[PDB]
Amino acid sequence: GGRMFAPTKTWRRWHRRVNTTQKRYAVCSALAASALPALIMSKGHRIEEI
């Protein structure tokens, strides 16, 4: 019935900011990866007949 150790504060740094160049970089890599048949099948999608 006491107080927990180090009570969780609401001002914890929840949000992280990423550089716009890196956010665009990750999209250019996720799109380039959506063009390879090996990566889409290894993801688990059923594209064996598309």
Partner 1 sequence: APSRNGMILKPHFHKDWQRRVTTWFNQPARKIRRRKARQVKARLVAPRPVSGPVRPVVRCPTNRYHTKVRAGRGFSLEELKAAGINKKVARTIGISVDPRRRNKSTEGLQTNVQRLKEYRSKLIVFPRKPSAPKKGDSTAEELKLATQLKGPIMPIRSVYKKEKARVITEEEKNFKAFASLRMARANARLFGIRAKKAK
Partner 2 sequence: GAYKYMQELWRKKQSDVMRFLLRVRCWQYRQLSSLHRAPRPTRPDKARRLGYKAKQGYVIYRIRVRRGGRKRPVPKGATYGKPVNHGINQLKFARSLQSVAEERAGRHCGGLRVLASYWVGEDSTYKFFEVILIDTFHKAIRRNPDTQWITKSVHKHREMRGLTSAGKKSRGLGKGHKFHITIGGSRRACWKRRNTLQLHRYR
Point out which residues bind partner 1 (CB under 8 A): 9-11
Establish if 3 lies at the interface with partner 2 (CB under 8 A): no
Of positions 8, 17, 31, 44, contacts partner 2 by CB under 8 A: 17
CB of 15 to partner 1, least distance (A): 9
Residue 28 Cα to chain centre, angstroms: 14
Interface residues with partner 2 (CB under 8 A) are 11, 13-17
